[PDB]
Write a protein that holds these residues in place. Structure first.
Motif, PDB file in Angstrom:
ATOM      1  N   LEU A  72      33.910  42.379  22.507  1.00 31.71           N
ATOM      2  CA  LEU A  72      34.733  43.139  23.403  1.00 31.71           C
ATOM      3  C   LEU A  72      33.830  43.960  24.327  1.00 31.71           C
ATOM      4  O   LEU A  72      34.206  44.494  25.378  1.00 31.71           O
ATOM      5  CB  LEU A  72      35.757  43.954  22.567  1.00 31.71           C
ATOM      6  N   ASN A  73      32.579  44.017  23.944  1.00 30.85           N
ATOM      7  CA  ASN A  73      31.615  44.728  24.762  1.00 30.85           C
ATOM      8  C   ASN A  73      31.165  43.835  25.913  1.00 30.85           C
ATOM      9  O   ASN A  73      31.281  44.142  27.111  1.00 30.85           O
ATOM     10  CB  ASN A  73      30.385  45.149  23.933  1.00 30.85           C
ATOM     11  N   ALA A  74      30.629  42.698  25.509  1.00 32.04           N
ATOM     12  CA  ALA A  74      30.207  41.728  26.468  1.00 32.04           C
ATOM     13  C   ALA A  74      31.337  41.611  27.505  1.00 32.04           C
ATOM     14  O   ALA A  74      31.111  41.559  28.709  1.00 32.04           O
ATOM     15  CB  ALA A  74      29.980  40.424  25.720  1.00 32.04           C
ATOM     16  N   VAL A  75      32.579  41.604  27.001  1.00 28.53           N
ATOM     17  CA  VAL A  75      33.759  41.467  27.837  1.00 28.53           C
ATOM     18  C   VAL A  75      33.897  42.599  28.792  1.00 28.53           C
ATOM     19  O   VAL A  75      34.092  42.381  29.960  1.00 28.53           O
ATOM     20  CB  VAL A  75      35.075  41.355  27.041  1.00 28.53           C
ATOM     21  N   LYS A  76      33.825  43.820  28.298  1.00 32.55           N
ATOM     22  CA  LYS A  76      34.011  44.964  29.167  1.00 32.55           C
ATOM     23  C   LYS A  76      32.981  45.026  30.286  1.00 32.55           C
ATOM     24  O   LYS A  76      33.256  45.378  31.450  1.00 32.55           O
ATOM     25  CB  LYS A  76      33.945  46.184  28.290  1.00 32.55           C
ATOM     26  N   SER A  77      31.776  44.648  29.927  1.00 35.99           N
ATOM     27  CA  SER A  77      30.674  44.625  30.891  1.00 35.99           C
ATOM     28  C   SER A  77      30.969  43.635  32.023  1.00 35.99           C
ATOM     29  O   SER A  77      30.856  43.981  33.194  1.00 35.99           O
ATOM     30  CB  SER A  77      29.285  44.330  30.260  1.00 35.99           C
ATOM     31  N   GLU A  78      31.347  42.397  31.622  1.00 40.97           N
ATOM     32  CA  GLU A  78      31.651  41.346  32.551  1.00 40.97           C
ATOM     33  C   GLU A  78      32.730  41.822  33.467  1.00 40.97           C
ATOM     34  O   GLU A  78      32.594  41.679  34.658  1.00 40.97           O
ATOM     35  CB  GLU A  78      32.093  40.061  31.849  1.00 40.97           C
ATOM     36  N   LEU A  79      33.783  42.448  32.930  1.00 42.03           N
ATOM     37  CA  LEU A  79      34.841  42.912  33.817  1.00 42.03           C
ATOM     38  C   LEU A  79      34.351  43.975  34.828  1.00 42.03           C
ATOM     39  O   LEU A  79      34.578  43.912  36.044  1.00 42.03           O
ATOM     40  CB  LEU A  79      36.092  43.355  33.037  1.00 42.03           C
ATOM     41  N   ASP A  80      33.635  44.959  34.321  1.00 38.74           N
ATOM     42  CA  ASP A  80      33.184  46.002  35.200  1.00 38.74           C
ATOM     43  C   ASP A  80      32.346  45.495  36.312  1.00 38.74           C
ATOM     44  O   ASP A  80      32.469  45.912  37.450  1.00 38.74           O
ATOM     45  CB  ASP A  80      32.457  47.046  34.364  1.00 38.74           C
ATOM     46  N   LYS A  81      31.487  44.566  35.956  1.00 34.57           N
ATOM     47  CA  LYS A  81      30.571  43.999  36.935  1.00 34.57           C
ATOM     48  C   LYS A  81      31.271  43.173  38.024  1.00 34.57           C
ATOM     49  O   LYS A  81      30.896  43.193  39.225  1.00 34.57           O
ATOM     50  CB  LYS A  81      29.550  43.224  36.097  1.00 34.57           C
ATOM     51  N   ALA A  82      32.340  42.457  37.563  1.00 35.79           N
ATOM     52  CA  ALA A  82      33.158  41.617  38.435  1.00 35.79           C
ATOM     53  C   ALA A  82      33.966  42.419  39.461  1.00 35.79           C
ATOM     54  O   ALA A  82      34.074  42.037  40.611  1.00 35.79           O
ATOM     55  CB  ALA A  82      34.063  40.768  37.608  1.00 35.79           C
ATOM     56  N   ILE A  83      34.496  43.552  39.010  1.00 36.83           N
ATOM     57  CA  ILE A  83      35.324  44.455  39.775  1.00 36.83           C
ATOM     58  C   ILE A  83      34.472  45.482  40.455  1.00 36.83           C
ATOM     59  O   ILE A  83      34.811  46.001  41.496  1.00 36.83           O
ATOM     60  CB  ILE A  83      36.271  45.239  38.863  1.00 36.83           C
ATOM     61  N   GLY A  84      33.361  45.794  39.863  1.00 37.08           N
ATOM     62  CA  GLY A  84      32.546  46.779  40.512  1.00 37.08           C
ATOM     63  C   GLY A  84      32.952  48.209  40.148  1.00 37.08           C
ATOM     64  O   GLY A  84      32.775  49.175  40.899  1.00 37.08           O
ATOM     65  N   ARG A  85      33.488  48.402  38.984  1.00 34.95           N
ATOM     66  CA  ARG A  85      33.812  49.764  38.646  1.00 34.95           C
ATOM     67  C   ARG A  85      34.061  49.841  37.173  1.00 34.95           C
ATOM     68  O   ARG A  85      34.079  48.791  36.525  1.00 34.95           O
ATOM     69  CB  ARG A  85      34.981  50.298  39.439  1.00 34.95           C
ATOM     70  N   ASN A  86      34.167  51.069  36.665  1.00 36.92           N
ATOM     71  CA  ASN A  86      34.429  51.267  35.219  1.00 36.92           C
ATOM     72  C   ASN A  86      35.917  51.070  34.962  1.00 36.92           C
ATOM     73  O   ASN A  86      36.759  51.870  35.352  1.00 36.92           O
ATOM     74  CB  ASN A  86      33.892  52.590  34.600  1.00 36.92           C
ATOM     75  N   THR A  87      36.254  49.966  34.332  1.00 33.64           N
ATOM     76  CA  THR A  87      37.633  49.622  34.162  1.00 33.64           C
ATOM     77  C   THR A  87      38.381  50.199  32.993  1.00 33.64           C
ATOM     78  O   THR A  87      39.193  51.099  33.143  1.00 33.64           O
ATOM     79  CB  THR A  87      37.859  48.091  34.310  1.00 33.64           C
TER      80      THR A  87
END
Length: 162
Positions: free
Chosen positions: A39-54
């Motif tokens: 769920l970490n790897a996941v959160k990172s990928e999302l943040d990076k994709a969106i460009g913000r802390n999700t």
């Protein structure tokens, strides 16, 4: 109907992280985030994709932007692939959408792997290709979706989506 509407129908829209049919973490309109379970790897990928802390949630506008980039990338992938491009060039506008649908779902490598079907599509042997395409893991795993795409290749109409 067009490619965006078609895919919007097949993938749905979820604004929170979810697992796809294969259990992988995705968000939005079928946007695959990662094959990893952390769920970490996941959160990172999302943040990076969106460009913000999700925090596992995105807005509709963010989902749409990712969707637009994804469709663009799938088209670009077909145009760059030596086995795919010729097929895509030989097809009419509705059928082109069917092919992009497959790429978006399974990637360029996956689709480029349906050699026999691809050749039948190029020769315009609609029925034959539909049968061949059905003989696959893809159809067995996601039959309703695969039936919609196949019908679209069979008929060259949007009837399956109507």
């Amino acid at each position: 109907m067009n490619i965006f509407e078609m895919l919007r129908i097949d993938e749905g829209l979820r604004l929170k992280i979810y697992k796809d049919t294969e259990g992988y973490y995705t968000i939005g309109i079928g946007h695959l985030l990662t094959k990893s379970p952390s769920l970490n790897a996941v959160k990172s990928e999302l943040d990076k994709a969106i460009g913000r802390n999700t925090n596992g949630v995105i807005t509709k506008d963010e989902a749409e932007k990712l969707f637009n980039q994804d469709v663009d990338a799938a088209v670009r992938g077909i145009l760059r692939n030596a086995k795919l491009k010729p097929v895509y060039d030989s097809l009419d506008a509705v059928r082109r959408a069917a092919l992009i649908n497959m790429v978006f779902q399974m990637g360029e490598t996956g689709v480029a792997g349906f050699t026999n079907s691809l050749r039948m599509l190029q020769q315009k042997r609609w029925d034959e290709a539909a049968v061949n395409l059905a003989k696959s893991r893809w159809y067995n795993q996601t039959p309703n979706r695969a039936k919609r795409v196949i019908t679209t290749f069979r008929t060259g109409t949007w009837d399956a989506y109507k």
